[PDB]
Amino acid sequence: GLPWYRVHTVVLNDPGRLIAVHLMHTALVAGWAGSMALYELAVFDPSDPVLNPMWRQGMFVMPFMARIGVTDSWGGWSVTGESVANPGFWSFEGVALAHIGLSGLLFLAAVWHWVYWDLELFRDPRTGNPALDLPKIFGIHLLLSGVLCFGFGAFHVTGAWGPGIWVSDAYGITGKVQPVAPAWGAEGFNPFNPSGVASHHIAAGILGFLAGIFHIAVRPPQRLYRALRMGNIETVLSSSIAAVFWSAFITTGTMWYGSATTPIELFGPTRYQWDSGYFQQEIERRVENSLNEGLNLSEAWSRIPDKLAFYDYIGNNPAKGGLFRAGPMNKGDGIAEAWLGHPIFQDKEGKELTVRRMPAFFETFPVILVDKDGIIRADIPFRRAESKYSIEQVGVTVSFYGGKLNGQVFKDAPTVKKYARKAQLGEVLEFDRTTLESDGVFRSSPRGWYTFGHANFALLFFLGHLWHGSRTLFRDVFSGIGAEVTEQVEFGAFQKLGDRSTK
C-alpha cells in the first residue's frame, strides 16, 4: 500500500483535509509556544537582571516576547528590572494562555475541517474535481501578508498603536521597549539601526499589498504555468521550503553576528564582542576618562557598572558551550553573585602585567602574563624545573580595584596565581555553584542554540527543497520510466535533447 514515508500524501489532493492538517500543525505550534512560556515562567528567576539576566537562565522563547513588547509579568516584575504595579493582560502569562487557547481553537477547527471536507469551495466549477486556484490564493495570502507587515511596521513597531520594540544602547546597559520612528534612507539599512525595522515593515508591507493586488488580478502566463507546474501544489511546497531555508539562514546570520533585532541583554553577547574586546575597550576608556577627571584607580573602577563588567567575561561567550552540555548557562560556571573588581598585576618592581585572555577556540589556555609591549614576563609553568618566567622568580602581586574585593593588595605568589587563572577568563566574578549544582563546564547562550538549530534546519530544508522541486518537476515519471525513454536517450538520435521533432 502506501509506505510509512508517503502517508501524508493522501491529503495532497484534498484541500479541505489539507486545511485540516495545517490547522492541526498550527494548533500544535501555538500550544508549544504557550507551554514553553509557562515552563520558562515556572523556572525563571526575575530577581537579579544585571548578573542573572534572562539569557543566563536558558530563556529561549521569552526574549522573543520581550523583543517586541511583552516585558511584564502578572507576578509584579519586569525583565527590565522594574517592579510592575498594575500589569495588563498582555504579560508573559497572558501571552502563554492566549497561545494555549488559540491552540485549542485551532484544534477544534482542524476537527471540523477533517470531518467536513467535501465543500463546494474546493471543487472546480469547470470540471467539478477538487482543485485550488493557487496563483490567486497566493495573491490573497500576499495581500494578507502585506497588510500585516504594514500594520506591524506602522502601528506596533512605531508605537502609534502599540508598545514599540526593544531598543538598547551600544553596550546593553540601558535597554527597554520603546517606539522607534522609521528611518527612511540609507541609515535604515544599517542592521544595527532599530529604526530600519519600522521603515522596512511599512514600505515592504506596502509593496506586498500592491503585489497582492497584482496576483489576484493578473493570471499567470501559460509559459511559466507549464514550466513551474503552477497547477501542482508541490511547486508551492518546493518554493515555500526554498524561501523558508533562505529566511532561516538570514536569521541565523543576524543571530550569530548580531543586529538591532537581537539585543545582547535578550540573547547574550556575541562571540565577536569578545574577540574584538568590545566591552574591554569600553571599560578601559571609561576608567581612562575617569582618571583624566582626577579620580584614582579605586574610584575609577568603582564607577564601572556590574552589568558592563559582566559582559566582559568569556563564560558569557556563546562560542564556549558544548553540543551536549545541556541546560542554563548558570548550570556551568554558576549563578553570578558579585564582581570582584579589576585585578591589576603589579610585578615585583611595579610594572603592570596583564594575563593574556583565553580565545574562544581553546578549551584550555596556558596562563601567561604578557608585558605592556607583550614580551612574556611571568606565567604558571607546566615544568617547574629550569623555569625562567615563574611568578616566584619574577615576583607578582594582585591589587584589586573596584568590585567587592576593592582596595585589597594580595602579594603572595599562590593568591596571585589563583587570580591569574581567573583573569585569563576576562573579568573575575563570584559564582554560586550550589543552587543548580553547577559542574564547572561552560554552556551556550540562547544565541548559540538558536544559531545551531536554525543552521541545521536551514541545511535540512535545502535538502527538502531539492527533493520537492525534483518531485514536482518529475511528476510524470514518479512510478518509473516507460519504453519511450529508450528511443530519445540514444546518442545522436535527435538533434535537440528530449525533443523528437528534431530528426
Partner 1 sequence: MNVSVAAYLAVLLGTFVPVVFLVTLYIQSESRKAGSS
Partner 2 sequence: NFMLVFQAEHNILMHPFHQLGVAGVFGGSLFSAMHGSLVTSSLIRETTENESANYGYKFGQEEETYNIVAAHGYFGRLIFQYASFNNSRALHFFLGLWPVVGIWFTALGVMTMAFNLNGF
Partner 3 sequence: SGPNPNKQPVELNRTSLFWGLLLIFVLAVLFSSYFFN
Long-range contacts formed by 289-298: CB under 8 A, 24+ apart:
297/344, 297/401, 298/401, 298/402, 298/406, 298/407
Dihedral sign (CA 417, 420, 422, 424): negative
Residue 493 grid coordinates:
538520435
From its phi and psi, is residue 128 left (phi > 0), alpha (psi between -120 and 50) or beta?
A: left
Helix axes 134-151, 233-257, angle to 10 degrees: 30
Footprint on residues 300-339 left by partner 3 (CB under 8 A): 323-326
Shortest distance, CB of residue 7 to ligand CLA, whole angstroms?
4
Residue 77 grid coordinates:
516584575
> Closest CB to ligand 8CT among 43 and 108?
108
Beta carbons of 324 and 377 less than 8 angstroms apart: no
Shortest distance, CB of residue 3 to partner 2, whole angstroms?
5
Q: Is residue 491 close enough to count as binding partner 2 by CB under 8 A?
A: yes
- The span from the CA of 181 to the CA of 195, in Å, is 6
Q: Is residue 191 close enough to count as binding ligand CLA by CB under 6 A?
A: yes
Using CB distances below 5 to 8 A depending on partner kind, what does residue 486 bind out of partner 3, partner 2, partner 1, none?
partner 2
Beta carbons of 181 and 198 less than 8 angstroms apart: yes
CB atoms within 10 A of CB 389: 15
Shortest distance, CB of residue 466 to ligand CLA, whole angstroms?
8
Burial of 302 (0-12, 13-18, 19+ CB in 10 A): middle
- The span from the CA of 332 to the CA of 328, in Å, is 8
Residue 369 grid coordinates:
602574563
- 156 annotated binding-site participant: no
- 107 annotated binding-site participant: no
Q: Is residue 4 close enough to count as binding partner 1 by CB under 8 A?
A: yes
Using CB distances below 5 to 8 A depending on partner kind, what does residue 14 bind out of partner 2, partner 1, partner 3, none?
partner 3
- 342 annotated binding-site participant: no
Shortest distance, CB of residue 449 to ligand CLA, whole angstroms?
4
Give 355's contacts (C-beta < 8 A, 6+ positions apart).
345, 367, 368, 369, 370, 420, 423, 424
Burial of 153 (0-12, 13-18, 19+ CB in 10 A): buried
3-class DSSP assignment, residue 190: coil
Q: Say how many residues touch ligand 8CT, by CB under 6 A.
A: 11
Residue 5 grid coordinates:
514515508
Minimal CB distance to ligand CLA: which residue? 58
Contacting range for partner 2; rule: CB under 8 A; set: 2-10, 164-172, 404-412, 444-452: 2-10
Q: Is residue 435 close enough to count as binding partner 1 by CB under 8 A?
A: no
Q: Is residue 460 close enough to count as binding ligand CLA by CB under 6 A?
A: yes
Among 68, 62, 266, 262, which Cα is nearest to 159's? 68
Residue type, 492: G
> Closest CB to partner 3 among 117 and 389?
117
CB atoms within 10 A of CB 24: 17
CA-derived radius of gyration, the chain: 30
Binding residue for partner 1, selected from 124, 293, 439, 499, defined by CB under 8 A: 439
Q: Is residue 11 close enough to count as binding partner 3 by CB under 8 A?
A: yes
Q: Is residue 481 close enough to count as binding partner 2 by CB under 8 A?
A: yes
- 465 annotated binding-site participant: yes
Q: Is residue 3 close enough to count as binding partner 3 by CB under 8 A?
A: yes
Contacting range for ligand CLA; rule: CB under 6 A; set: 70-78, 414-422, 456-464, 488-496: 456-464
Footprint on residues 86-115 left by ligand 8CT (CB under 6 A): 100-101, 103-105, 107-108
Beta carbons of 139 and 217 less than 8 angstroms apart: yes
- 238 annotated binding-site participant: yes
Query: From start to end of 371-433, where are the E strands?
Result: 376-379, 396-401, 409-410, 429-432
Footprint on residues 3-42 left by ligand 8CT (CB under 6 A): 28, 31-32, 35
Using CB distances below 5 to 8 A depending on partner kind, what does residue 430 bind out of partner 3, partner 1, ligand CLA, none?
none
Contacting range for partner 2; rule: CB under 8 A; set: 44-52, 309-317, 439-447, 484-492: 484-492
Binding site for ligand CLA (CB under 6 A): 4-9, 40, 43, 58, 60, 184, 188-189, 191, 196-197, 199-200, 203-204, 207-208, 237, 241, 246, 249-250, 254, 259, 323-324, 326-328, 446, 449-450, 453, 460-461, 463-464, 467, 471
**Binding-site annotation: residue ranges:** 8, 22, 25, 67, 99, 113, 141, 152, 200-201, 215, 238, 454, 465, 467-468
Known binding positions for chlorophyll a: 8, 22, 25, 67, 99, 113, 141, 152, 200-201, 215, 238, 454, 465, 467-468
Q: What is the contact surface with partner 3 in residues (CB under 8 A)? A: 1-4, 7, 10-11, 13-14, 16-17, 115-119, 323-326
